[PDB]
């Protein structure tokens, strides 16, 4: 297992322990357990790039100790 970091504009960092191959949708649910955020209202951003739920972390070449930018998308899923 590897650990990655998720940030919010509000100012809180979230720490997640996950293995590569996990999907973005899968990582979103992991956020759900940690910080009570609905996967329906999440946009994951990495290196100026928006992550789609079908692709694994390995596809975006996300690696251990990396940082992500979580944004809340309302009025949309």
């Amino acid at each position: 297992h590897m650990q990655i970091f998720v940030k919010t504009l509000t100012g809180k960092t979230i720490t997640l322990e996950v293995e590569p191959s996990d999907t973005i949708e899968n990582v979103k649910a992991k956020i759900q357990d940690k910080e009570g955020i609905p996967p329906d209202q999440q946009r994951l951003i990495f290196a100026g790039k928006q992550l789609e739920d079908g692709r694994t972390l390995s596809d975006y070449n996300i690696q251990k100790e990396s940082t992500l930018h979580l944004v809340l998308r309302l009025r949309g899923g």
Partner: protein, 959 residues
């Protein structure tokens, strides 16, 4: 001590001649009419009182210039006995003048023929004899020796025989009378050339030019006509040997007749003649003559007539006015008028010798004095830094010689102005920290005084209030008296002290500028015109002062045609006595009685100060029985140039008392050439050490340069694009904040650059951030602020280095540039109040840049340049004249060695004038004084060899 202008015995004799003969109407027929000037009557305008009065001044004048001439190597014309005009004594000159008063008393008419001539001079010799006869009880004992004497001068007034060359008494009285005719006769060139050649035979060429020079000033002082001298005067020349003329006929050639072994010979003074064809010779034709051009200075020259500064209309008014009448009538007034004119002609020639001054004002601080006053200030502020043999500040060790250099090169009056009352108050703190011992200047058997303990207790009792104004008076009071203080302070200041401790040299260096400041603030009295200063010196050391003083008085002469300025310049630069009253707050009085009587001084410095330069400040309170003291810190471009050197009686100890009268003269030629850096260079290293502490502390108190925090705020900016935040906020981070982090990344990562300095400026203000309401922008700011303090911390660190790099290689200008880099406040307020220790430094250099570079070739590049050419030409013509010198005996060789001894001194003057008139940054050209110095070394061994030859030939002879 004798002088025409101050001898009542001589003036009384003049009053007599006026009341009885000169002041009475002309009972003659021819031209005896009364003259009116401004509504006042003068019975005899041509040969009245102003006439016989001037003539006496001439005698005074010609004898002075004569004695000056002999003080130069000049050989005056001898009479039947080996005496010259310069051998005339004060007593003999008094007899001459008293005789000279009645020399025109016998006049009844203005008639000019031989019969009338004998008669009037017949009457004149009697009038003299009558006056002497009346007052024989007061004259014949002391003023004269016997009746024989009186008959000698009475015989001269008669002039039965036509001799005028017989003796000094004769030459003076006759020339003095005839030269006063310059103001009336109408071919000025013809007459002047004549009267010049006459006097040149007895007195000398330079001495004569001084005479007619100071003679023009006597005319202006007595309101008589000053004629011009026009080289191009086309009026008919008049031969003065009688009333003949010169003639040129047919071929444009002057008539002549040729005797044996003379080739072409002297001109046929055709008397006045009627001719043709034939034409009379003009003044210019005469002046351009090969005979005249090589013997008369005035050939090719021009002297402007009348008065300079007024048209000839308003000049005519000045001639026809009351003072013209008061002069011909008032004997006291007439003497004063000449007196001041003569005394004036002793100063002006000194002014002309050097380049002009501007205003009297004291100078402005240079780099070194600015930095100097800073050091002194901190010493008084933080006495803790004072040690047993050095003072330590910001890691810089300031030894003894430094504070000596500070006293030697720094206008301490000027450094004193840069100090304040706070610096005065630090005397108390300075004196508390000190409990050290001041010693006496000489008097080794004297009680040492604890200076720290003395000062403090001095203020407790005397300064109960602690009033700052008073403190200054007390400091000044401490200056006067207490010879355990001023003896050491003055002896140290002028670098003529012995066995002085570091604490004594240090405190002098400090107390000097402070005392000066105290004097400037205190003294609200008008600057005196005349001050007196007494010193105690060996009669033999005073002997050397009189020689140096006589050198300058001898070579400075009023001008007529030829300019003898360069030489006066040289002699004054060689014997100057000014640096005896400088470098310290020398004390002086305004009442003579204090130096003569109370202190019994053998040497007195009378310092004339009419132009108000030499600003002197009062000391203590003046009154009836007070010292009436004034302190003087001699300005560095002002010199005290001797005008007269008089012997005045003796002291209580039997030795003669000499009174030198000096005259303050301000000129850039007197400013000392000091290499800068002596006080500022240590001061720069001081500030560099002070920044080294601020840099070090900042380098480790707030630190590290996290790179990742930039990357995140760059990722967040691109991330807030899909945030459902404002339309402007997404544009503010992408367009405004985006590029800032862009450049901030390049700067930090790649070296330093002005990129870091410029990017730091592109950072949005707190105002722009607040206008984004409240939200996740707050979380953006603290990220941004974290980044600013990253760029800022770097730029502030590179500026301290690049500045410290400056200071190491001086470039105080370049240092300040960097410190203008450091950000202020909102751009940088993450470093504590060592911002104070940093702004304090930029403030130190803001003041060091306020330097003034005062100029020494202040104009008169022509004077400085021209003057140099004369000197080098002169000195080279003196060396080449000694180069081929016949050395027959031992005497000629002895004369040569002392010559070479003097030439050696001259050439160095030549050297410094090269240095002081040179501008730029390159090798100072010495190519000319090189060829001279080599000639010197040649005629140094030539003499030294030829010397042993003669000393040997002498012992040989003696066996």
């Amino acid at each position: 001590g004798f002088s025409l202008y101050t001898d009542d015995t001589v003036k009384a004799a003049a009053q007599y001649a006026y009341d009885n003969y000169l002041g009475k109407p002309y009972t003659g027929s021819v031209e005896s009419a009364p003259a009116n000037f401004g509504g006042r009557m003068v019975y005899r305008q041509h040969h009245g009182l102003s006439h016989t009065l001037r003539t006496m001044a001439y005698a005074e004048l010609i004898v002075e210039e004569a004695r000056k001439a002999k003080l130069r190597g000049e050989t005056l014309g001898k009479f039947k006995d080996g005496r010259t005009i310069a051998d005339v004594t004060p007593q003999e000159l008094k007899k001459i003048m008293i005789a000279q008063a009645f020399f025109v008393a016998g006049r009844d008419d203005e008639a000019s023929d031989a019969k009338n001539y004998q008669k009037y001079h017949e009457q004149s010799r009697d009038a003299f004899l009558k006056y002497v006869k009346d007052n024989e009880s007061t004259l014949i004992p002391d003023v004269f020796k016997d009746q024989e004497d009186v008959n000698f001068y009475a015989r001269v007034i008669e002039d039965k025989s036509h001799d005028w060359e017989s003796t000094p008494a004769h030459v003076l009285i006759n020339q003095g009378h005839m030269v006063d005719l310059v103001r009336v006769k109408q071919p000025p060139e013809s007459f002047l050339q004549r009267y010049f050649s006459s006097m040149q035979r007895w007195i000398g060429s330079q001495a004569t030019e001084a005479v007619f020079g100071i003679q023009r000033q006597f005319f202006h002082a007595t309101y008589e006509v000053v004629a011009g001298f026009d080289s191009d005067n086309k009026e008919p020349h008049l031969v003065v040997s009688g009333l003949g003329r010169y003639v040129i006929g047919e071929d444009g050639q002057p008539i002549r007749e040729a005797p044996k072994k003379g080739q072409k010979e002297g001109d046929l003074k055709v008397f006045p003649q009627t001719y043709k064809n034939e034409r009379l010779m003009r003044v210019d034709e005469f002046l351009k003559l090969p005979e005249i051009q090589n013997t008369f200075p005035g050939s090719g020259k021009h002297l402007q007539g009348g008065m300079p500064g007024m048209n000839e209309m308003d000049y005519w008014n000045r001639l026809n006015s009351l003072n013209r009448a008061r002069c011909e009538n008032d004997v006291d007034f007439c003497l004063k008028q000449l007196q001041t004119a003569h005394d004036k002609a002793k100063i002006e020639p000194i002014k002309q010798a050097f380049q002009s001054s501007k205003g009297k004002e004291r100078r402005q601080p240079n780099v070194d004095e600015i930095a100097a006053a800073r050091i002194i200030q901190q010493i008084l502020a933080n006495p803790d830094c004072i040690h047993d043999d050095h003072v330590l500040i910001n890691g810089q060790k300031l030894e003894q010689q430094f504070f000596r250099d500070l006293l030697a090169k720094c206008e301490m009056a000027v450094v004193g102005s840069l100090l304040n009352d706070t610096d005065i108050g630090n005397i108390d703190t300075l004196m508390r920290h000190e409990k050290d011992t001041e010693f006496h200047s000489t008097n080794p058997e004297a009680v040492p005084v604890k200076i720290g303990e003395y000062w403090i207790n001095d203020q407790r009792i005397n300064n109960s209030s602690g009033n700052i104004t008073q403190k200054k008076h007390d400091l000044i009071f401490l200056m006067q008296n207490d010879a355990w203080y001023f003896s050491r302070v003055n002896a140290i200041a002028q670098n003529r002290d012995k066995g002085s401790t570091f604490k004594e040299v240090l405190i002098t260096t400090l107390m000097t500028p402070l005392t000066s400041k105290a004097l400037v603030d205190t003294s609200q009295a008008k600057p005196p015109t005349r001050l007196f200063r007494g010193l105690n010196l060996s009669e033999e050391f005073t002997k050397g002062l009189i020689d140096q003083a006589n050198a300058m008085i001898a070579n400075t002469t009023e001008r007529l045609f030829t300019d003898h300025s360069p030489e006066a310049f040289k002699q004054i630069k060689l014997n100057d006595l000014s640096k005896m009253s400088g470098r310290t707050n020398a004390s002086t009085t305004t009442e003579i009685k204090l130096v003569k009587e109370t202190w019994d001084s053998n040497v007195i410095f009378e310092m004339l100060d009419p132009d108000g330069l030499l600003h002197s400040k009062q000391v203590g309170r003046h009154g009836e029985g007070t010292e009436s003291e004034f302190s003087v810190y001699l300005p560095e471009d002002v010199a005290l140039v001797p005008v007269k050197v008089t012997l005045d009686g003796k002291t209580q100890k039997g030795e003669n008392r000499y009174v030198f009268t000096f005259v303050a003269v301000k000129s850039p030629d007197f400013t000392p050439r000091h290499e800068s850096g002596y006080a500022v260079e240590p001061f720069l290293r001081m500030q560099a050490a002070k920044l080294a502490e601020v840099k070090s502390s900042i380098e480790k108190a707030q630190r590290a340069p996290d790179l990742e925090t930039i990357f995140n705020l760059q990722n967040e900016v691109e991330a807030v694009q899909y945030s459902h935040l404002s339309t402007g906020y997404k544009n503010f981070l992408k367009n405004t904040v985006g590029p800032v982090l862009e450049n901030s990344l390049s700067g930090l990562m790649e070296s330093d650059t002005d990129t870091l300095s410029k990017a730091l400026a592109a950072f949005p203000s707190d105002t722009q951030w607040s206008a984004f309401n409240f939200e996740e922008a707050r979380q953006a700011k603290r990220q941004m602020d974290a980044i600013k303090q990253m760029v800022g911390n770097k730029v502030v660190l590179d500026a301290l280095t690049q500045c410290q790099d400056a200071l190491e290689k001086q470039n105080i200008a370049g240092a300040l540039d960097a410190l203008k880099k450091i950000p202020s406040e909102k751009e940088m307020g993450t470093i504590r109040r060592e911002l104070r220790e940093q702004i304090q430094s930029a403030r130190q250099e803001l003041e060091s840049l306020q330097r003034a570079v005062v100029t020494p070739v202040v104009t008169d590049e022509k004077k400085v340049r021209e003057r140099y050419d004369a000197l080098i030409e002169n000195t080279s013509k003196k060396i080449t004249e000694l180069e081929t010198g016949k050395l027959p005996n031992l005497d000629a060789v002895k004369k040569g060695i002392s010559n070479l001894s003097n030439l050696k001194q001259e050439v160095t003057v030549l050297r410094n004038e090269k240095i002081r008139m040179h501008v730029g940054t390159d090798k100072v050209d010495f190519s000319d004084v090189e060829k001279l110095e080599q000639q010197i070394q040649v005629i140094d061994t030539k003499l030294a060899d030829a010397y042993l030859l003669e000393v040997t030939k002498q012992i040989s002879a003696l066996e």
